Design a protein around this ligand. Structure first.
Ligand SMILES: *[C@@H]1O[C@H](CO)[C@@H](O[C@@H]2O[C@H](CO)[C@@H](O[C@@H]3O[C@H](CO[C@H]4O[C@H](CO)[C@@H](O)[C@H](O[C@H]5O[C@H](CO)[C@@H](O)[C@H](O)[C@@H]5O)[C@@H]4O)[C@@H](O)[C@H](O[C@H]4O[C@H](CO)[C@@H](O)[C@H](O)[C@@H]4O[C@H]4O[C@H](CO)[C@@H](O)[C@H](O)[C@@H]4O[C@H]4O[C@H](CO)[C@@H](O)[C@H](O)[C@@H]4O)[C@@H]3O)[C@H](O)[C@H]2NC(C)=O)[C@H](O)[C@H]1NC(C)=O
Ligand SMILES: CCCCC/C=C\C/C=C\CCCCCCCC(=O)O[C@H](COC(=O)CCCCCCCCCCCCCCC)COP(=O)([O-])OCC[N+](C)(C)C
Ligand SMILES: CCCCC/C=C\C/C=C\CCCCCCCC(=O)O[C@H](COC(=O)CCCCCCCCCCCCCCC)COP(=O)([O-])OCC[N+](C)(C)C
Ligand SMILES: CCCCC/C=C\C/C=C\CCCCCCCC(=O)O[C@H](COC(=O)CCCCCCCCCCCCCCC)COP(=O)([O-])OCC[N+](C)(C)C
Ligand SMILES: CCCCC/C=C\C/C=C\CCCCCCCC(=O)O[C@H](COC(=O)CCCCCCCCCCCCCCC)COP(=O)([O-])OCC[N+](C)(C)C
Ligand SMILES: *[C@@H]1O[C@H](CO)[C@@H](O[C@@H]2O[C@H](CO)[C@@H](O[C@@H]3O[C@H](CO)[C@@H](O)[C@H](O)[C@@H]3O)[C@H](O)[C@H]2NC(C)=O)[C@H](O)[C@H]1NC(C)=O
Ligand SMILES: *[C@@H]1O[C@H](CO)[C@@H](O[C@@H]2O[C@H](CO)[C@@H](O)[C@H](O)[C@H]2NC(C)=O)[C@H](O)[C@H]1NC(C)=O
Ligand SMILES: *[C@@H]1O[C@H](CO)[C@@H](O)[C@H](O)[C@H]1NC(C)=O
Lengths: 149, 112, 258, 438, 196, 41, 85, 34
């Protein structure tokens, strides 16, 4: 499962370029009798187009009676838009091959979800000048009507 | 073949620097001094002052005229901060329909 | 003249500018042909809703308009390299086209074939425009002056080239076409050439899942790679034609294991 | 809820028919009561997997049949049968249960060629799950040509004796109570197409101004027959058409829609466009889909036609402005099984529903509104029924709606459109008596 | 306006803000919503999208009437409307099923040019602002708006070389350029392109 | 993609030879309105 | 009760329609001529010249008449083209 | 629904009524205007 870093899912808010997500997969082995938790290194997440954009090794950070989980940490999505697949191919010879993939769409920023003009330090000049032209325009129309020619 | 593989971290693009902030403060109050220079040039110093004010029964159409001219800038000023295009559009419809009648009886009342 | 303008302007509209682009009335008899909605509605009804259909670009909107599926190329040609991907895949052996059509997660590949009814806008005469735009990106992999018969002809029958016979779109479009009529002869109606079943080499990486009534729109599927890791042409040469209950035991000359 | 006592089965036949892509049983019981308080009820036991998929349940007397009050309830689950003329505590009675199911079986070779016969695998009981003791009970498996068992038992009894197009056997004496001792699996050839739809929504539209009723149906049909190996090839299909005569085989080429008597404006569309391969002859609407529906394939389409309203609607006697409509509950191909049906009838804009009666026990019913063309006010009255499990051949019924539609609300349609045209033209008058000239 | 469209160009997508002209879709969606909620009859969106070029064929005819009424008397405007209503050069790109983005283009070319000629005759500021609103709404629709921004300046410039300058020609052109060039810059397909 | 003359006669019936005579007749009383039609022609 | 409604159904008269569909497009054409003559002569009562109260009076009575003929006309012409009500 | 030959007759008769009343308007305008 993958979700946002603050807990929300892809379903409630779809993803976005330069976003904070978390990914979590859990493994389990079988000694013939019980499903025990699987201690392992070498497990690698891949965020992937045609070419891979992320290979992150998975730290455990979790436990259960019959499952040891693995996380990847909060990682930032690429600014490249597109349809990225989330892939774990655990392929180690000797023991069982597993593949988990989930294909998701990761979109550009909306027109609303930009740094705002009052927020940015550079656009205070132009907000002040547009506000100056507007207020001087209002005194221009009131002064123009109330004068006598 | 199978085994461990080197990591990839996707080195991001750099953002261009914004501005030094007190320079922007300096130009903000320079533009403030220019607009205040405009108003102080208008109201008394260049003698383009209020020669006539319609104090009769056509004053209410003049206040309606100021209600339209200030009203559309209040609507646009609300549109600058949030306030989606449809609520702005119905706002300037609900101002533009009574407001065009009281901003035309006024300009019928003044033939200059 | 004002009255003659009306009769001209209605005759020209009725004859030359009022025809559907979907129903194709070629009258192979005043017969209508809706093989495009038949095939695209097969994709809409009988495919999982996230399958990816890699067809040539000038049919890219209609698929997404009618099949409601995901394509790879499309009518506006804003990325020419991603169109040279599909153009490279359509004109290459299927060993090197399976490799490039699974690297992009493609499971369906459809082609247009107007050889049974004479459509002429099929994907075998706009096939050179798949080699021109993919030769300028990848030279010496896909190249023109192949697909020709060493005197400058563009042939389709048993006189044709070896690169033309082993191409992907050739053996995808002309599959089961000589077994159509009788006797092992097939008169291609557009190209006016007769092909034989000793032509059209078999297809070991793809398998057809749909073919329309007048054989216009063929829909193929990338069958999954083999479980025991061997290549699919070795599975194909395993399951047939080899070798008359005759064997040979030999040092396999395989090198060394890493 | 287990029944106590007071019924003992002397004779018990059980004839399963398997011949038209839904399982039908015709049980024939002859019961004896015990010396006690004379009780008047009966309990028929079904498994939990068969009780979920059952579409018809009825009872006869064998002497001369009238009907009986057969009620289906709502882990062996039961169905009650209520007798009139409460029975003396020692007297033989006779009885016939008929029942129609939804399941037909699994294709036992699930991949088979299109020119080859298919064989299906059905699973059932051999000893009958009766809530009471039986003294004699014979089984009869009527249906198609070839029947064969699956994992035959070692006992030479409880083994099938094949008859001419039949398969007769059964545990014949002294079965004590609820007996899940052995589950039968039988394979059998079955050359019907096995059409079944998943979601049928059918919308009808009563209209008092046009005096017409307008049917529109949306079918989502699958073919649950055996899937075909080596994919689909048009060469083998077209050669299979050109060889001979198109006998009985799996896939779907044509559908015969049995419509009401005088139907006028026939149409047949897909999602992407309309389909021109349809033939609307008198009383019969033949349909060819775009692709032949092989085993496991989907096809969602829409048909529609137009009847006059004078034979589906009837003015009541006490009030002139009270109408009673009886709607055909189901029209379709002759061999189909309906997994979901939602019947939306649409009364006009001022109609008010008084009484609702349905012959088939529905799953749901509700009354909403929906705005069609020139519904300026609230809109049409959408009375929608939800039926779950239906058979094309079995569920012969008509839905009876009793409503009113007074002439105060009959003329409010042209008066409402007149109200919009009038307020639009007075809006033109206000925008032309108004002075704006700076 | 913010639609990623992951169903096309599969690994890449198509942003459809800066690869689309959002003026045909919001017009036919305004007609669909308008006769949906305000007028009483709910018709399907496929019928709005098909019967769209026959609807604006007539508005092209009315706008050609008003344009030729600004060039000569109205009796030539009815000849021009009768010509362009049924002419085979426009019915080619205006067939009944044709939602191909020149169904809305010419019925804004003629309203744009009608308010331009009506703005340049009388020298009115208002007719040259509502020439610029239909110039903007012509930019929202079709990618051959460039023709207008090389024809209205070609007209005014030929008014300069002939010695026919006036205050009407100034007072029309300079507010056409002001409003029409601050306004056509808002379509995300056409960004700061009219600056550079 | 150049075009031949039967598309010009084909798309417009007799308007194709009133099209130049309209321009030549719009010169002979040349208002400021008609420069638009001449340049646009 | 399904049996009471079944008896009450099959002992009843059929639906006698108000206006049949085959005579109804003629009512649509004649109604279009009537409401087009009445509303076409209604915009000239406000059109030419008058006082205000007589222009309001004749405009509102002639717009009532032409409006109701317009609504009944588009009901019949709605039913004529294939859509119903 | 209307056929295609009947639509051809409808389109031509709208064209002929259109051009006819255009010519009538131009004659009445050109005769009786200063
Ligand atoms: C239109 O459609 C077109 C087709 O659909 C599309 O074109 C494709 O666009 C993508 C996106 O750019 C291309 O992918 C890139 O291709 C680069 C080409 O490199 C060539 O040359 C290299 C040698 O110089 C070869 O290594 C390379 O690959 C070869 O080897 C592979 C393995 O052996 C083999 O699979 C190949 O087939 C080939 O044989 C190729 O020949 C390629 O360099 C680039 O790789 C980087 O980026 C990937 C992620 O994007 C990483 O997975 C990969 O590991 C590389 O990462 C480097 O860059 C990242 C940031 O970009 C860093 O985060 C990494 O850490 C790493 O950085 C190292 O290197 C940097 C220098 O590059 C250095 O600065 C760092 O410090 C660090 O040292 C990627 O694969 C694709 O090739 C295009 N395909 C075609 C056919 O054109 C086009 O985009 C579409 N148009 C639009 C507008 O979208
Ligand atoms: C004297 C009276 C004066 C009245 C002035 C009124 C209008 C001035 C005339 C023209 C203005 C042009 C600028 C366009 C602004 C709207 C863009 C918008 O609406 O989209 C914006 C986003 O921009 C865009 O992506 C560009 C979209 C381009 C629109 C394309 C459609 C044009 C065709 C429409 C015609 C349809 C048929 C009608 C027939 C008549 C959504 O804004 P928002 O909802 O997030 O609001 C929040 C406001 N934040 C973000 C600033 C806080
Ligand atoms: C200032 C404002 C002035 C006031 C305006 C107020 C009112 C006027 C506006 C609308 C009045 C009526 C228009 C609705 C006609 C829909 C026809 C239709 O859509 O029919 C289409 C197809 O049509 C036809 O076959 C013939 C075409 C005839 C249409 C003529 C067009 C003239 C209408 C004006 C332009 C279009 C406007 C709407 C589209 C933007 C239905 O398609 P189908 O295949 O699904 O049906 C098939 C029938 N089965 C489902 C039963 C099978
Ligand atoms: C401005 C003055 C008036 C302008 C008049 C303009 C054009 C009229 C001339 C020809 C148009 C008729 C051609 C119809 C083509 C077949 C229809 C079809 O087949 O399409 C219909 C679309 O229904 C329509 O659009 C309605 C069109 C009605 C037009 C009748 C004339 C009224 C004009 C409006 C006047 C002003 C309105 C004021 C309101 C306050 C698709 O129905 P469906 O798919 O749901 O079928 C299933 C039907 N169930 C749902 C019942 C099962
Ligand atoms: C701006 C002005 C617009 C000018 C004209 C615009 C567009 C015309 C272009 C094409 C139209 C061709 C029609 C194609 C569809 C075929 C349907 C057909 O032909 O219906 C024909 C009959 O029709 C007619 O008798 C026409 C009746 C009279 C027309 C009245 C005009 C309508 C306007 C009224 C609005 C009044 C409100 C005033 C608001 C101010 C039958 O067909 P059916 O067998 O399918 O009916 C189904 C079978 N039953 C008969 C059982 C139902
Ligand atoms: C045509 O009608 C058929 C029949 O209703 C539709 O098929 C149904 O489609 C839905 C969604 O595609 C299927 O739901 C799916 O269920 C599976 C598990 O069974 C799950 O993995 C999916 O995520 C999804 O929830 C549904 O099973 C399927 N029904 C049958 C019987 O196959 C079909 O969608 C309709 N097609 C069109 C184009 O309208
Ligand atoms: C029975 O039908 C009613 C219809 O009134 C269903 O209630 C609606 O269910 C939908 C869920 O798809 C909700 O969105 C609506 O708000 C519900 N409406 C009302 C009035 O409750 C109900 O779910 C159906 N029940 C069953 C068991 O089928
Ligand atoms: C932690 O993991 C080990 C793995 O062997 C398991 O035995 C142990 O029970 C786990 N403890 C908890 C608290 O989950």
């Amino acid at each position: 499962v993958h979700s946002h870093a603050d807990g929300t899912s892809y379903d409630e808010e779809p993803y976005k370029i330069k976003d904070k997500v978390i990914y979590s997969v859990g493994f389990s082995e079988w000694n013939g009798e019980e499903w025990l938790p699987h201690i392992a290194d070498d497990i690698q997440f891949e965020l992937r187009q045609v070419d891979p954009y992320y290979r992150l090794t998975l730290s455990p950070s979790g436990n259960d009676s019959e499952t040891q989980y693995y996380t990847t940490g909060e990682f930032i999505l690429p600014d490249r838009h597109g349809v990225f697949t989330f892939l774990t191919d655990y392929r180690k010879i000797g023991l069982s091959f597993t593949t988990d993939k989930d294909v998701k769409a990761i979109r550009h920023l909306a027109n609303d979800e930009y740094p705002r003009s009052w927020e940015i330090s550079n656009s205070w000049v132009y907000i002040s000048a547009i506000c100056g032209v507007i207020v001087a325009w209002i005194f221009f129309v009131v002064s123009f009507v109330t004068t006598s020619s | 073949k199978f085994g461990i593989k080197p990591e990839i971290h996707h080195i991001f693009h750099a953002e261009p620097k914004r501005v030094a902030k007190p320079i922007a403060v300096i130009f903000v109050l320079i533009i403030f001094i220019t607009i205040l220079s405009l108003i102080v040039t208008w109201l008394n110093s260049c003698a383009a002052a209020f020669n006539n004010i319609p104090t009769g029964v056509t004053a209410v159409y003049f206040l309606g005229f100021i209600a339209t001219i200030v009203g559309f800038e209040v609507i646009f000023a609300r549109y600058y901060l949030g306030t989606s295009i449809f609520e702005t559009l119905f706002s300037s419809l609900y101002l533009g329909a009574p407001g065009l009648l009281t901003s035309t009886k006024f300009l019928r009342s003044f033939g200059q | 003249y004002l009255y003659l303008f009306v009769f001209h302007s209605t005759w020209v509209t009725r004859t030359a500018y009022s025809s559907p682009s979907v129903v194709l009335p070629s009258q192979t008899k005043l017969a209508l042909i809706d093989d495009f909605r038949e095939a695209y509605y097969w994709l809409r009804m009988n495919s999982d809703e996230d399958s990816k259909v890699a067809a040539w670009w000038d049919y890219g909107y209609q698929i997404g308009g009618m099949a409601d599926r995901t394509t790879l190329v499309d009518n506006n040609t804003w990325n020419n390299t991603h169109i040279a991907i599909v153009g490279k895949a359509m004109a290459s052996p299927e060993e090197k086209s399976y490799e490039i059509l699974k690297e992009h997660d493609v499971d369906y590949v459809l082609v247009i074939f107007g050889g049974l009814i004479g459509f002429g806008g099929d994907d075998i005469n706009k096939f050179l425009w798949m080699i021109r735009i993919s030769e300028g990106i990848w030279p010496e992999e896909i190249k023109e002056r192949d697909f020709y018969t060493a005197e400058g002809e563009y042939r389709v029958d048993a006189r044709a080239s070896e690169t033309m016979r082993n191409s992907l779109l050739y053996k995808m479009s002309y599959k089961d076409f000589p077994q159509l009529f009788n006797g092992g002869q097939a008169t291609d109606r557009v190209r006016q050439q007769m092909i034989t079943p000793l032509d059209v080499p078999p297809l070991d990486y793809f398998d057809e899942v749909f073919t329309s009534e007048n054989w216009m729109v063929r829909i193929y599927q990338l069958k999954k790679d083999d479980a025991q890791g061997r290549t699919l042409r070795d599975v194909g040469e395993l399951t047939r034609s080899s070798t008359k209950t005759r064997r040979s035991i030999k040092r396999p000359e395989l090198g060394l294991r890493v | 809820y287990e029944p106590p006592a007071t019924w003992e089965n002397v004779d018990y036949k059980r004839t399963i028919d398997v011949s038209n892509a839904y399982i039908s049983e015709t049980i024939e019981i002859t019961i004896k009561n015990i010396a006690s308080e004379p009780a008047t009820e009966y309990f028929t036991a079904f498994e939990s997997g068969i009780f979920s998929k059952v579409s018809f349940f009825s009872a006869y007397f064998t002497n001369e049949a009238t009907f009986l009050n057969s009620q289906l309830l709502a882990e062996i689950r039961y169905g009650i049968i209520q007798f009139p003329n409460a029975i003396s505590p020692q007297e033989e009675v006779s009885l016939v249960i008929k029942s129609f199911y939804n399941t037909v079986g699994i294709p036992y070779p699930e991949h088979v060629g299109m020119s080859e016969e298919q064989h299906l695998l059905w699973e059932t009981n051999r000893l009958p799950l009766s809530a009471y003791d039986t003294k004699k009970a014979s089984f009869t498996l009527i249906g198609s040509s070839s029947f064969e068992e699956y994992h035959p038992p070692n006992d030479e009894s409880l083994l099938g004796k094949a008859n001419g197009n039949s398969f007769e056997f059964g545990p014949w004496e002294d079965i004590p109570r609820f007996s899940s001792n052995e589950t039968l699996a039988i394979v059998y050839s079955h050359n019907a197409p096995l059409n079944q739809v998943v979601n049928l929504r059918r919308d009808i539209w009563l209209s008092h101004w046009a005096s017409t009723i307008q049917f529109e149906e949306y079918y989502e049909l699958t073919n649950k027959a055996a899937k075909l190996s080596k994919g689909f090839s048009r060469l083998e299909l077209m050669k299979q058409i050109q060889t001979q005569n198109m006998r009985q085989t799996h896939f779907v080429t044509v559908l015969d829609m049995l419509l009401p008597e005088g139907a006028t404006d026939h149409y047949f569309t897909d999602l992407v466009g309309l389909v021109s391969t349809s033939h609307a002859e008198r009383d019969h609407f033949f349909i060819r889909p775009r692709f032949p529906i092989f085993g496991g394939w989907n096809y969602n389409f829409t048909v529609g036609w137009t009847n006059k309203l004078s034979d589906f609607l009837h003015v009541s006697s006490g009030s002139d402005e009270k109408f009673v409509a009886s709607i055909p509950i189901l029209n379709g191909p002759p061999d189909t099984v309906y997994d979901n049906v939602e019947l939306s009838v649409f009364l006009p804009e001022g109609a008010e529903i008084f009484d609702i009666d349905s012959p088939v026990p529905f799953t749901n019913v509700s009354i909403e509104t929906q705005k069609s063309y020139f519904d300026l006010n609230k809109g049409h009255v959408k009375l929608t029924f939800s039926y779950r499990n239906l058979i094309s051949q079995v569920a012969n019924g008509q839905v009876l709606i009793k409503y009113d539609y007074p002439k105060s609300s009959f003329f409010k349609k042209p008066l409402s459109i007149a109200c919009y045209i009038f307020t639009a033209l007075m809006g033109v008058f206000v925008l032309k008596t108004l002075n704006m000239n700076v | 306006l913010n639609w990623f469209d992951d169903r096309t160009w599969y690994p890449l997508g198509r942003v459809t803000g800066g690869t689309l002209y959002p003026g045909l879709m919001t017009t036919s969606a305004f007609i669909w919503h308008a006769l949906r909620n305000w007028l009483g009859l709910p018709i399907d969106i496929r019928n709005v999208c098909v019967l769209f070029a026959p609807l604006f064929s007539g508005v092209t005819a009315w706008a050609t009437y008003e344009f030729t009424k600004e060039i000569k008397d109205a009796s030539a405007g009815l000849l021009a409307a009768g010509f362009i209503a049924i002419v085979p050069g426009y019915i080619s790109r205006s067939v009944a099923g044709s939602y191909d983005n020149e169904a809305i283009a010419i019925t804004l070319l003629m309203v744009t040019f009608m308010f331009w000629i009506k703005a340049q005759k009388t020298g009115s500021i208002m007719h040259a602002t509502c020439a610029a609103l239909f110039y903007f709404y012509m930019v929202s629709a079709w990618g051959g708006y460039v023709f207008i921004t090389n024809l209205i300046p070609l007209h005014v410039f030929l008014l300069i070389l002939m010695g026919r300058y006036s205050s009407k020609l100034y007072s029309a052109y300079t507010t056409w350029y002001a409003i029409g060039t601050v306004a056509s810059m808002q379509i995300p397909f056409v960004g700061f392109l009219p600056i550079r | 993609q150049p075009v031949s003359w039967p598309a010009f006669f084909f798309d417009t019936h007799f308007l194709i030879w009133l099209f130049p005579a309209g321009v030549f007749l719009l010169f002979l009383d040349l208002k400021d309105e008609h420069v638009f039609v001449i340049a646009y022609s | 009760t399904y049996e009471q409604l079944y008896k009450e159904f099959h002992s009843s008269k059929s639906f006698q329609p108000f206006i049949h569909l085959d005579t109804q497009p003629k009512f649509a054409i004649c109604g279009l001529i009537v409401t087009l003559a009445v509303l076409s002569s209604a915009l000239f009562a406000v059109g030419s010249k008058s006082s205000y109260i007589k222009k309001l009076f004749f405009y509102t009575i002639l717009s009532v008449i032409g409006s109701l003929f317009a609504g009944l006309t588009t009901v019949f012409a709605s039913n004529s083209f294939g859509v119903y009500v | 629904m209307i056929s295609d030959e009947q639509l051809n007759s409808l389109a031509i008769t709208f064209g002929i009524v259109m051009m006819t009343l255009i010519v009538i308007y131009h004659a009445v305008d050109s005769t009786m205007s200063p």
